[PDB]
Amino acid sequence: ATVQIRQKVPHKRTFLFLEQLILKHNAHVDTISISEAKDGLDFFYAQKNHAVKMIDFLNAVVPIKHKKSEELISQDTHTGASTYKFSYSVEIVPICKDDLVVLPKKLAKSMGNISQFVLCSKISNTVQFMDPTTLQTADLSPSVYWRAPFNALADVTQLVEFIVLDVDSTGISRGNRVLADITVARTSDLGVNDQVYYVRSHLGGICHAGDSVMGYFIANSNYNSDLFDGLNIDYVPDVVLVKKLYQR
Amino acid sequence: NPVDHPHGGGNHQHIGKASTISRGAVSGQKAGLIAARRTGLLRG
Amino acid sequence: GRVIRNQRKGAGSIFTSHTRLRQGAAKLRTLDYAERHGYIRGIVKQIVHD
Amino acid sequence: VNVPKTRKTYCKGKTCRKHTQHKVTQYKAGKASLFAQGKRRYDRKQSGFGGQTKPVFHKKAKTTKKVVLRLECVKCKTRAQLTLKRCKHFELGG
RNA sequence: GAAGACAUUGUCAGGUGGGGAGUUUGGCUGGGGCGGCACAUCUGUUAAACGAUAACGCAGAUGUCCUAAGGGGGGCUCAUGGAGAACAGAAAUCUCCAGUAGAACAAAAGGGUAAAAGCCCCCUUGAUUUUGAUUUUCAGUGUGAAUACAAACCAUGAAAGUGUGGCCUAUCGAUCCUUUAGUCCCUCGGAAUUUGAGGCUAGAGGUGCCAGAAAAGUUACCACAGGGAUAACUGGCUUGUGGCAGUCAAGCGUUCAUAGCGACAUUGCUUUUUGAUUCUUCGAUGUCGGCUCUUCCUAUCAUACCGAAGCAGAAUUCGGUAA
RNA sequence: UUGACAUUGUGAAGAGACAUAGAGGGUGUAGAAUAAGUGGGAGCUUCGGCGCCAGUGAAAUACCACUACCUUUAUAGUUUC
RNA sequence: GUGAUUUCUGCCCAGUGCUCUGAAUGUCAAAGUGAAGAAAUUCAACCAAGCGCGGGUAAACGGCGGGAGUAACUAUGACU
RNA sequence: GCCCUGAAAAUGGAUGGCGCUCAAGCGUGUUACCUAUACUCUACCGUCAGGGUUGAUAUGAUGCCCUGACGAGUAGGCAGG
RNA sequence: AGAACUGGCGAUGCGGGAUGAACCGAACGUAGAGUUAAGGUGCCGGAAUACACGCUCAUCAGACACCACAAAAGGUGUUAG
RNA sequence: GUCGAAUUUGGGUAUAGGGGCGAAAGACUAAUCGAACCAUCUAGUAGCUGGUUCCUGCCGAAGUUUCCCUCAGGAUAGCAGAAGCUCGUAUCAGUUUUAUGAGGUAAAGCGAAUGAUUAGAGGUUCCGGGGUCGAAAUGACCUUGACCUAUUCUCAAACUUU
RNA sequence: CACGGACCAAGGAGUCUAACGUCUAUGCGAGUGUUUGGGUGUAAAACCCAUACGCGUAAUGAAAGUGAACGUAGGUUGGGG
Numbered sequence A: 001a002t003v004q005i006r007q008k009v010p011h012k013r014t015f016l017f018l019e020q021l022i023l024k025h026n027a028h029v030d031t032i033s034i035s036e037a038k039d040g041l042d043f044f045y046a047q048k049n050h051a052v053k054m055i056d057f058l059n060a061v062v063p064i065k066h067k068k069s070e071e072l073i074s075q076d077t078h079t080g081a082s083t084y085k086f087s088y089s090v091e092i093v094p095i096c097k098d099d100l101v102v103l104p105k106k107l108a109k110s111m112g113n114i115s116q117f118v119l120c121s122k123i124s125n126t127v128q129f130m131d132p133t134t135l136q137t138a139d140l141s142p143s144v145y146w147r148a149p150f151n152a153l154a155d156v157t158q159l160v161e162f163i164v165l166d167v168d169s170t171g172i173s174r175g176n177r178v179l180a181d182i183t184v185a186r187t188s189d190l191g192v193n194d195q196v197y198y199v200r201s202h203l204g205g206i207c208h209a210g211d212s213v214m215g216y217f218i219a220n221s222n223y224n225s226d227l228f229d230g231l232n233i234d235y236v237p238d239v240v241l242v243k244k245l246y247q248r
Numbered sequence B: 001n002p003v004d005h006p007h008g009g010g011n012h013q014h015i016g017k018a019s020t021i022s023r024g025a026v027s028g029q030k031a032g033l034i035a036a037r038r039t040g041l042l043r044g
Numbered sequence C: 001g002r003v004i005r006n007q008r009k010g011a012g013s014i015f016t017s018h019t020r021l022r023q024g025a026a027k028l029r030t031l032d033y034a035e036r037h038g039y040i041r042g043i044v045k046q047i048v049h050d
Numbered sequence D: 001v002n003v004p005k006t007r008k009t010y011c012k013g014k015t016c017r018k019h020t021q022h023k024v025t026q027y028k029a030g031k032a033s034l035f036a037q038g039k040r041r042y043d044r045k046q047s048g049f050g051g052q053t054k055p056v057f058h059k060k061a062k063t064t065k066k067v068v069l070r071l072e073c074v075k076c077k078t079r080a081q082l083t084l085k086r087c088k089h090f091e092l093g094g
Numbered sequence E: 001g002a003a004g005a006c007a008u009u010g011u012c013a014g015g016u017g018g019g020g021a022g023u024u025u026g027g028c029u030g031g032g033g034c035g036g037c038a039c040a041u042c043u044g045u046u047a048a049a050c051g052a053u054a055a056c057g058c059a060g061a062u063g064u065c066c067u068a069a070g071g072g073g074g075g076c077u078c079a080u081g082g083a084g085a086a087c088a089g090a091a092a093u094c095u096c097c098a099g100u101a102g103a104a105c106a107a108a109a110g111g112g113u114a115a116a117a118g119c120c121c122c123c124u125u126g127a128u129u130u131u132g133a134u135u136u137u138c139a140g141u142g143u144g145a146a147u148a149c150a151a152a153c154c155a156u157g158a159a160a161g162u163g164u165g166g167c168c169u170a171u172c173g174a175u176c177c178u179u180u181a182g183u184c185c186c187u188c189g190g191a192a193u194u195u196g197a198g199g200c201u202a203g204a205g206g207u208g209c210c211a212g213a214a215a216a217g218u219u220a221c222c223a224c225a226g227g228g229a230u231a232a233c234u235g236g237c238u239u240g241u242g243g244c245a246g247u248c249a250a251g252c253g254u255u256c257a258u259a260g261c262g263a264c265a266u267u268g269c270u271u272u273u274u275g276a277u278u279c280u281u282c283g284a285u286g287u288c289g290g291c292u293c294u295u296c297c298u299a300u301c302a303u304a305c306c307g308a309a310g311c312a313g314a315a316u317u318c319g320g321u322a323a
Numbered sequence F: 001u002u003g004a005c006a007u008u009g010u011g012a013a014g015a016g017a018c019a020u021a022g023a024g025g026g027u028g029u030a031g032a033a034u035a036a037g038u039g040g041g042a043g044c045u046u047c048g049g050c051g052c053c054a055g056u057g058a059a060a061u062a063c064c065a066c067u068a069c070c071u072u073u074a075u076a077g078u079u080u081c
Numbered sequence G: 001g002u003g004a005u006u007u008c009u010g011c012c013c014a015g016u017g018c019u020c021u022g023a024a025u026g027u028c029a030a031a032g033u034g035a036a037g038a039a040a041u042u043c044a045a046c047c048a049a050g051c052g053c054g055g056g057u058a059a060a061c062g063g064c065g066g067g068a069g070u071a072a073c074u075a076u077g078a079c080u
Numbered sequence H: 001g002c003c004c005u006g007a008a009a010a011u012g013g014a015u016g017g018c019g020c021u022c023a024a025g026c027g028u029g030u031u032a033c034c035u036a037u038a039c040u041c042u043a044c045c046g047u048c049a050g051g052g053u054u055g056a057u058a059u060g061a062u063g064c065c066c067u068g069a070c071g072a073g074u075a076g077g078c079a080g081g
Numbered sequence I: 001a002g003a004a005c006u007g008g009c010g011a012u013g014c015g016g017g018a019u020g021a022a023c024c025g026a027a028c029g030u031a032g033a034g035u036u037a038a039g040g041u042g043c044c045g046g047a048a049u050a051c052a053c054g055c056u057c058a059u060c061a062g063a064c065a066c067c068a069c070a071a072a073a074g075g076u077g078u079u080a081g
Numbered sequence J: 001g002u003c004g005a006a007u008u009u010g011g012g013u014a015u016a017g018g019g020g021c022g023a024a025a026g027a028c029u030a031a032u033c034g035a036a037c038c039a040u041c042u043a044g045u046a047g048c049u050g051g052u053u054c055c056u057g058c059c060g061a062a063g064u065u066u067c068c069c070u071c072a073g074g075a076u077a078g079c080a081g082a083a084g085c086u087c088g089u090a091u092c093a094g095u096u097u098u099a100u101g102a103g104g105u106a107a108a109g110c111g112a113a114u115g116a117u118u119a120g121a122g123g124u125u126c127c128g129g130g131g132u133c134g135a136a137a138u139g140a141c142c143u144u145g146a147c148c149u150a151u152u153c154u155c156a157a158a159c160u161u162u
Numbered sequence K: 001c002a003c004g005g006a007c008c009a010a011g012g013a014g015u016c017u018a019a020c021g022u023c024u025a026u027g028c029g030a031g032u033g034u035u036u037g038g039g040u041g042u043a044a045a046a047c048c049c050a051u052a053c054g055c056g057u058a059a060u061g062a063a064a065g066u067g068a069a070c071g072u073a074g075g076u077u078g079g080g081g
């Protein structure tokens, strides 16, 4: 038997985390061969019972849509009990830790009436979402994703760095995170232009004026997503801050 | 078997889904506990 | 699908009440002047089983 | 990609017919009126028991849009449309 | 007696509604299913000295990037090595010699390129308009990309000249529908005005299953038309692996390479084993084992006769004919 | 199942949104001080009223570029509960 | 639903379901109201149930893993 | 070069068989001989082509006459019957 | 399993290879005579138990290419070198 | 097996087809049931199977290109037939020669390239990416980083001048 | 050793239609078509017929709309007769 892990994305952030974790826990003992692939890889085993062990290991740490198929090897006579080659298809959810997404209308209306403009926040057995404009966290299961799958609007590569100017933590707070009313500029318009963007981020407790952060700039983007085309373009943020590029 | 009843069928004897039916359900669905505010034994 | 025995209990035809041996409908007497004003006396002739 | 807010380009006007200065700005579509013949027809067709009667497109593949620039002459106010390639990032270079 | 212009009843509208109805649930394919996309395309190789030439054949690649990484002109020459200069080190900056490209040219590989197609600087928007002819895939249809001119307007340069995107080869899309730009053109058909609508000419929104259906499963209760174009048990071909044999025999076998056992390998046998093929059977070849019964093969377990042995006898081993 | 219209007539009270003038509109240690954006703002005002520097400052004041957090009544009513 | 009797029926309301005598505006159709317009029409506010939020519920569907630390060693079917 | 051993498989059996040993075997060479719907000659049928003939006889040319070549055939096409 | 060139079968009979869809020869109107192909001439079987120089005796010889199987290693068995 | 009862049974009577009844097997519903029977729409459609009627003569193929929810099928081009039209030995040909061009395979020739080179002695820099946790103030972790010349040995062999 | 066929007789399977394409024959010929209908009739036939209509004689364009001789109805190359 064998399992075929795939994440249908070019950049696979939840995969390196996964294999790092696999070596951390040492769950790759009965692995007889590891074969790379286009977008994921494979793990080979000599008994179904050690493959399902690792499937159980995966379905607790990351979200998956797993299956099973058989090919017939040799119809053993005198018993009726033949032998076979198995194959499991694991599909990881194609969303990573820090991706901008646009949920569908009816799903967002059910996961707390959260806005569709969303950032992924944490990857586990379930996939966790957060609205940065206002601290509202949700959680979505794979059994609900794979019913009506959607795809991210922008990956981590499309990020671009900004330089923060003023940090107003007037906003409300939650654990580990606090809402702000930052003003912030781009490090291709500073020094040359004098236009600034004001953002209701969730980094009032982290980022101080004069350090480089990382965010999506929506106004310069040329997206085509039928869901994004279903939103009120005027209530869209022109910037979405994500993380901080601390200097080392 | 499932023609006969919603609880029907299966390679075991299981309902599959909850027996707490709604009140606004229809004829042929209301086979269980109909508008349960509560189920189960309280303490004994 | 079929219809369940709950759905089949509404037209009757075998789920009717078996009403041969019943003495009758057990019902208080009708509200009349004697019972709105004063009283009226009656007497038991037999206790029976329904 | 970047494209500045001005460029000198051929105006097809009756008066110009020369290279003139043109203000460029991105093309945004209209609001999809309701008294269009092909919306009236759709309404009339959906009106009934019927069902959904026309297709519905799910199987998207493209992740971009071809960029269209609306140029406008500064002396004629005559307009024009140019198209570019597909891109994920576009801004006007003011 | 109760309730009372509320219920009820009628018509619309929203929600709920597998309780029920109707339908669908892609292709390629060393079976089908996973996986992959060889389903639209690019490079080298397959490919066998024009061209064409397949495989779920190999090594890779595309669904992007750029107002400069496009265009024109000018000036300079790169990787690298050597000899030198305080801090200075294998390596910071400066100078000389050699240097046919061993560098770089957004990105795959291939081709190409040196007063350049590269490195720096200057001016710019030919990444423009009208429409046609041609080459490539090819039906000589489309789409896509390119080639060469014409009529205009522009840039650049002293000028010759070059420039109709990227040094060349890939980097993308029909009808219907919607929308925008334009002539300020046509029509709204009893005659007019203003809105509104429809039209013509170029474009965009998209079908990636990429010449382009709107779509989830199960049947072990199942069914029909058919198929050895195709799995099923049987065979027939093949020998990777199975079982057996022969030659080389390191070396172990009280010192005494085969009395005997065993390397490296090497040639090669049988169909009595798996794998592989799909050639015969899909409008009936009845599919495990056992009971029964007969015959054949020898690659001999015993029996008979021989030979050799670290074969005294005894007991064993090996060996030969022999079924 | 919920809403609207009709069936559907006759009433009485109360509360609520618009419609002109209202202004009660500015309250962390506290800086005198009950501090919204602001506007040139150190000056227009009768007495200079204060401010400018100063002083917590988040606020910077007077005066106004005069939009100004903008709170409850009164109007002829417009009408939902 | 379970299936005589006897003895027991543990821990979970996060999820899906069901439910509520809980909050109020976040969404929220048709009719109705207001504004612009010559009008068709367009826009806005108000807006029922439902959704959403909060709670309850397991003899309701069902689920009941893996670590990291208790000082020389030991980290327990303990403790954090 | 030949021959032998190596070289073992299952109904009784296959240089095709009998049978052959200075071959009726193997290598090589020389003539003679046998025979296919093939080749050559002739006759006949048919088709294809070229040409002569309305002198005018049976006015008919639908024909008559001369010359040469050729003939496989599934699906399928046409013609004459 | 997948390709390139030619030829053929399929659509194709005839002589030969005993037999065979594909090999050799050769492509077909009905018949006669003659000559040959590829293959063959002991008898079956039409045709030389023909000629010539040599090799081989096999206790499963050998005998018409495709074809219907055969290697490595050995023999003073023999022949020639 | 059961045999005094949830017993067996006649007659009458109710329930009728996506409906009935079911101590529940998808069982029974007139030899019919995972949806009865009868007539009609109905000569249902079938890219699938089978068959397809007389003679002779002449000519005579294809299993390949491109597109198709396309792979037991269609359109398209090709092959083939028939009808002939304009003309009358042109200028044509599955061919050769002469002249002039393109090619980069066979052959030839060179040493080499990063791995396992069967490796050998070493040289240590930090040259770091990526993942998690970072009210990031300063920053840690599991992870992957490192290499220095000598290049043998046998030929593994990538190339091009001709 | 794939499917059908025990046997005989009779029946038994690319037709009819509407609208069309190429080709051919015939009539008339920038015209053509008699046959909806009418007159007439030896009576479903045959014979006679006006008007209109159809196709064609003029195309193009989305449409409004415009609408085919510079010339011995052109020049050059070939061209039967």
Ligand SMILES: [Zn+2]
Pocket: D011, D012, D013, D016, D017, D020, D073, D074, D075, D076, D077, D078
């Ligand atoms: Zn202009």
